[PDB]
Write a protein that binds this DNA or RNA. Structure first.
Ligand SMILES: [Mg+2]
Ligand SMILES: [Mg+2]
Ligand SMILES: [Mg+2]
Ligand SMILES: [Mg+2]
Ligand SMILES: [Mg+2]
Ligand SMILES: [Mg+2]
Ligand SMILES: [Mg+2]
Ligand SMILES: [Mg+2]
Ligand SMILES: [Mg+2]
Ligand SMILES: [Mg+2]
Ligand SMILES: [Mg+2]
Ligand SMILES: [Mg+2]
Ligand SMILES: [Mg+2]
Ligand SMILES: [Mg+2]
Ligand SMILES: [Mg+2]
Ligand SMILES: [Mg+2]
Lengths: 99, 100, 127, 208, 151, 116, 83
RNA sequence: AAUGCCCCGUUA
RNA sequence: CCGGCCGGGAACUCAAAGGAGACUGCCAGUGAUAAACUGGAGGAAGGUGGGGAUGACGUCAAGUCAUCAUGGCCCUUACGACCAGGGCUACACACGUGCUACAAUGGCGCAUACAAAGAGAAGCGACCUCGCGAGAGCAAGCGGACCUCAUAAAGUGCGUCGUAGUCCGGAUUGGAGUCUGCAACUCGACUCCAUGAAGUCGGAAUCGCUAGUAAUCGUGGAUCAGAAUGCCACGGUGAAUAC
């Protein structure tokens, strides 16, 4: 089997990317597990917005890293090179892992 | 900050990357519990001889845009002010004003 | 034929499974007297079975996660009430009047910048 | 100073991010630095071109930079030399294969940064800030912006006591969040110091 | 407050006997959120007082609260060119709470060994019309009677 | 109960009774009791004389009041005679470990002395 | 205190200078700035002028100071009294 | 039906 | 192998992702046939359901030329640059903000139960061994719903202490050490042994808080080679009162 881990800061982008992945999988190979959504990372930051002195004035930002996992259990010869040829949008990190 | 301080930090990091290996193995042979007393003595002496700026503990994290030493954020390499301005301008991907 | 219910509290989550039996209790593979070593927790988890006198007619295999003892007790009470709904569908008005179906949304408030806690301000002084 | 940045507060709902790429903590900093240097060099080089917005996306070890500008004929110069030189130099800067795209933005009188740069050029060539602001607002409302505000501040007219003036026309709601508020700013370096200018352009509410 | 009157929040009765009064008493006695410790203390002291004075815990507690219960408190009015300490009647919830508060305060002040013992001694003294609780009750009654010239 | 040249609380438990000695804390006292083979909660009053003799032998194996007095005094004197930073601090009455002194040094500086 | 296994720390230049001085038998103030170096038995009978900011204060090394550092004997903050 | 009170340097 | 272990099951918690829902919607009354208010039927939530972000015209010539940018002025063999050491930590004293306490709702020893939220590659660093301990040697797994950080504490049951400046308090100090770092004297943190100040609830005066709030109990992170009782976040128990 092969696991594909997608991650991105854009929810709609990651969702459409994993949709394209599962589509090409069901097209070329068969028996793709599914796009299971994993817990998202929320990396927070607090920043003093004043230049010199304001210890109570603070902006509070956070990066939301959404994560998705899909699994293919019946990998054919064409599926691998197909998903390798597939170049996806910018802002999505994809990791392949056999096993 | 000052161009002098920025160039100083650059020299610090350069010498650190240069003498990393030798300093690392010297620290290793020193901390080695199964090493000879005289060998460890000579190793400490050579470490002393080595430049001080070659120590990674000597370099200070500075904003890559202004050189500000305070308010540094490792995740971005910029001071808090530059981080906020870039976020507001839309340069830091994924970063947005939070609430909960 | 087990009837299922879900209860929730501050940070707790309780799965309740009820079957008509003698009226024994099992919480996380333990009895209530062993899990909730507190009379208040025991009374609150038993409340609905006294509101509607069926404490000796239904055994139940309950599990719970998250929160403390009182939070888990409230979650178990909520789940037991929900399961009683799913089972009877006639005690809804009684449990409403008793105040058991309303899921307590009194969640812990967050800490805000410039404050020592959610609402406490630091020491203020003119001088 | 209390007002929050419109782009910052709308960066998730309606307004998008300029830089759109994913990275881990190991290269986030160097990626930010490369983006800063690229934007700096572009703004420095093509300044006489009405560049509105430089966006960057680095998918799979290859940077793609889209310049939304109003004078693409100028940014390209003779067909196929300037863009190629810029691609080569930016690839050298970033250490990654570079690709360049040009986006012709119609109605340059509706871009917050183009109007700001125009006003900057005006009151650097010593044009009356009042006339500049008024003509900008008029051109915008004529081209059809549902709202526009423009403010200047600092050493207006070589005065010794600095002040801030602002002209508003139409409907520019900032407290609302779904509104399309293209906001930007710039600054002029005159003999008497620095004059800052900000521009808000309300296109219309976006019901997504 | 100025704008509106509010709704009262519910208090869960105690498991041992089901008395909302006892629940309020233990909620007054507790500190730093140690309701378990407060319940242990109050139950121990109540059982002690019961086996001491005969009748059950509820009867002992209610007779003590009745002996400590006030009826007329005093308030400041500041009407016009003169300030007045006018006496005014008390409502049931208010007088019950004041009785409980005075009782717990007297227990805290008492220099016995254990808090349960302190509370039991104070409750017995109040039932037999003794202690700083009934003392303060009589003091406020005397003050109200003195200031009775205002209505 | 007289041990190490000083009396001992008779009604207190053995552990605290031994801690009452200058130079013996809770852990050293527990070790003494273990070596002597006596419970940590046995009162000295109900104890026999042989156990007290064993305790005397153990405290003698360890250091005692006057010995500690002499050791501490001689160390501090050596310091303040060498004139090191620590000796200077000792003689001047200021903290030695390196605490702040522009405020909150009352333990060494004694009560406050108004300026007059 | 420094780690025992690491051994005592002393500057190479100070060590070489004290070696030369003890070999030459010269009784001169050995000027240095290494207030961090710990004293060694080879220094007894000598006089080290260690920097303390303004200038080098001289200290005559004895035996019972061996386990110490010259910064302990070279003060830096000059304080007499507020009034 | 009328218990506390007095004051803020100069130019701009 | 009594451990969801490992077949299996996709029901449930859970993970998101998309939707439904709460809008005075309906009922009775009041109101000027209105707005709107009162009460109740449903409902998880009823009237802004709770919290956060969002801060108009402008004031304080408020703060920041030491984040940055910048007009003018000022030095150009020094007001520029480099290096070692010291200082920014001083100390007759006064003030503000916090932590720890004065104790029995407690201290101590034993056993034991219930979380959330986050970090990790010059990193987190199991297990095992050594050392009373800080930690040291070996060292798997982990770019992490998988491994580590990481044991939650208050609480619960048992025994003791029995109101003693005490088995409360831990400051100060002496001795021996561990870690980082070239280098812990000025000037880091921590451990072990011993020592055991003041304090016995605090004058005038004054502060925060209206509910999962105060109060209390712990946990994590940014900074960071090392260095918080502060800052920012998470959760457990959980009040009184508002005529
Ligand atoms: Mg994580
Ligand atoms: Mg500069
Ligand atoms: Mg004050
Ligand atoms: Mg604001
Ligand atoms: Mg210090
Ligand atoms: Mg006068
Ligand atoms: Mg209602
Ligand atoms: Mg220096
Ligand atoms: Mg300072
Ligand atoms: Mg406190
Ligand atoms: Mg960390
Ligand atoms: Mg306990
Ligand atoms: Mg005293
Ligand atoms: Mg000790
Ligand atoms: Mg006492
Ligand atoms: Mg805390």
């Amino acid at each position: 089997r092969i696991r594909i881990r997608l991650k991105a800061f854009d929810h709609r982008l990651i969702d459409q990317a994993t949709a394209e992945i599962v589509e090409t999988a069901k097209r070329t190979g068969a028996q793709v597990r599914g796009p299971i959504p994993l817990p998202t990372r929320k990396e927070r930051f607090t920043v003093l917005i004043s230049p010199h002195v304001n210890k109570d004035a603070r902006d509070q930002y956070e990066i939301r890293t959404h994560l998705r996992l899909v699994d293919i259990v019946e990998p054919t010869e064409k599926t691998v090179d197909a998903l390798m040829r597939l170049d996806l949008a910018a802002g999505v990190d994809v990791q392949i892992s056999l096993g | 900050a000052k161009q002098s301080m920025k160039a100083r930090e650059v020299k610090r990091v350069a010498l650190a990357d240069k003498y990393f290996a030798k300093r690392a193995e010297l620290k290793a042979i020193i901390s080695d519990v199964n090493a000879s007393d005289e060998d460890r003595w000579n190793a400490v002496l050579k470490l002393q001889t080595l430049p001080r700026d070659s120590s990674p503990s000597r370099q200070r994290n500075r904003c890559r845009q202004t050189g500000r030493p305070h308010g540094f954020l490792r995740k971005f390499g910029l001071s808090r002010i530059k981080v906020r301005e870039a976020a507001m301008r839309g340069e830091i991907p994924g970063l947005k004003k939070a609430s909960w | 034929n087990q009837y299922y219910g879900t209860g929730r509290r501050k940070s707790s989550a309780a799965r309740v499974f009820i079957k008509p039996g003698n009226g024994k209790i099992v919480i996380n593979q333990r009895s209530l007297e062993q899990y909730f070593g507190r009379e208040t927790a025991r009374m609150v988890v038993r409340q609905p079975l006294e509101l509607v006198d069926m404490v000796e007619k239904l055994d139940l295999y309950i599990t719970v996660k998250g929160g403390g003892i009182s939070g888990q007790a409230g979650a178990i009470r909520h789940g037991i009430t929900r399961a009683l709904m799913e089972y009877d569908e006639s005690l809804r008005s009684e449990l409403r009047k008793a105040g058991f179906v309303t899921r307590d949304a009194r969640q812990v408030e967050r800490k805000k910048v410039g404050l020592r806690k959610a609402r406490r301000r630091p020491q203020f002084s003119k001088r | 100073g209390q007002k929050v940045h419109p782009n910052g507060i709308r960066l998730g709902i309606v307004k998008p991010w300029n830089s759109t790429w994913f990275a881990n903590t190991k290269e986030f900093a160097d990626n930010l630095d490369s983006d800063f240097k690229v934007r700096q060099y572009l703004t420095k080089e093509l300044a006489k071109a009405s560049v509105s917005r430089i966006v960057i996306e680095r998918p799979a070890k290859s940077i793609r930079v889209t310049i939304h500008t109003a004078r693409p004929g100028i940014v390209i110069g003779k067909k196929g030399e300037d863009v190629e030189k810029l691609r080569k130099v930016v690839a050298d800067i970033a250490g990654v294969p570079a690709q360049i795209n040009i986006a012709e933005v119609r109605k340059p009188e509706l871009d917050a940064k183009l109007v700001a740069d125009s006003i900057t050029s005006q009151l650097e060539r010593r044009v009356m800030f009042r006339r500049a602001m008024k003509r900008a607002v008029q051109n915008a409302m004529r081209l059809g912006a549902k709202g526009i505000k423009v403010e200047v501040s600092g050493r207006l007219g070589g005065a010794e006591i600095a002040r801030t003036e602002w002209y508003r026309e139409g409907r520019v709601p900032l407290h609302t969040l779904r509104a399309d508020i293209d906001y930007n700013t710039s600054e002029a370096h005159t003999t008497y110091g620095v004059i800052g200018v900000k521009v808000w352009i309300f296109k219309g509410e976006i019901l997504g | 407050p100025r704008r509106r009157v509010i709704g009262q929040r519910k208090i869960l009765p105690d498991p041992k006997f089901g008395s909302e009064l006892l629940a309020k008493f233990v909620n007054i006695l507790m500190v730093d959120g140690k309701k378990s410790t407060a319940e242990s203390i109050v139950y121990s002291a109540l059982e002690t007082l019961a086996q001491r004075s005969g009748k059950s815990e509820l009867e002992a507690f209610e007779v003590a609260l009745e002996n400590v219960r006030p009826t007329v408190e005093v308030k400041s009015r500041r009407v016009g060119g003169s300030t007045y300490q006018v006496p005014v009647e008390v409502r049931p919830v208010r007088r019950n709470a004041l009785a409980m508060r005075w009782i717990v305060e007297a227990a805290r002040k008492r220099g016995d060994k254990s808090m349960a013992l302190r509370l039991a001694n104070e409750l017995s003294d109040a039932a037999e019309n003794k202690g700083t609780a009934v003392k303060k009750r009589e003091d406020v009654h005397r003050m109200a009677e003195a200031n009775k010239a205002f209505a | 109960a007289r041990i190490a040249g000083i009396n001992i609380p008779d009604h207190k438990h053995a552990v605290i009774a031994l801690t009452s000695i200058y130079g013996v804390g809770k852990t050293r006292s527990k070790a003494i009791l273990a070596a002597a083979g006596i419970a940590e909660d046995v009162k000295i009053s109900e104890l026999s004389e042989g156990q007290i003799d064993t305790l005397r032998d153990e405290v003698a194996k360890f250091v005692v009041e006057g010995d500690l007095r002499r050791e501490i005094s001689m160390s501090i004197k050596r310091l303040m005679d060498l004139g090191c930073y620590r000796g200077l601090r000792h003689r001047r009455g200021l903290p030695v470990r390196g605490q702040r002194t522009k405020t909150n040094a009352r333990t060494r500086k004694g009560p406050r002395k108004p300026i007059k | 205190p420094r780690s025992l296994k690491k051994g005592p720390f002393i500057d190479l230049h100070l060590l070489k200078k004290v070696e030369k001085a003890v070999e030459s038998g010269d009784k001169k103030p050995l000027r240095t700035w290494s207030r961090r170096s710990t004293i060694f038995p080879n220094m007894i009978g000598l006089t080290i002028a260690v920097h303390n900011g303004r200038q080098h204060v001289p200290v005559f090394v004895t035996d019972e100071m061996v386990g110490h550092k010259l910064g302990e004997f070279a003060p830096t903050r000059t304080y007499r009294g507020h009034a």
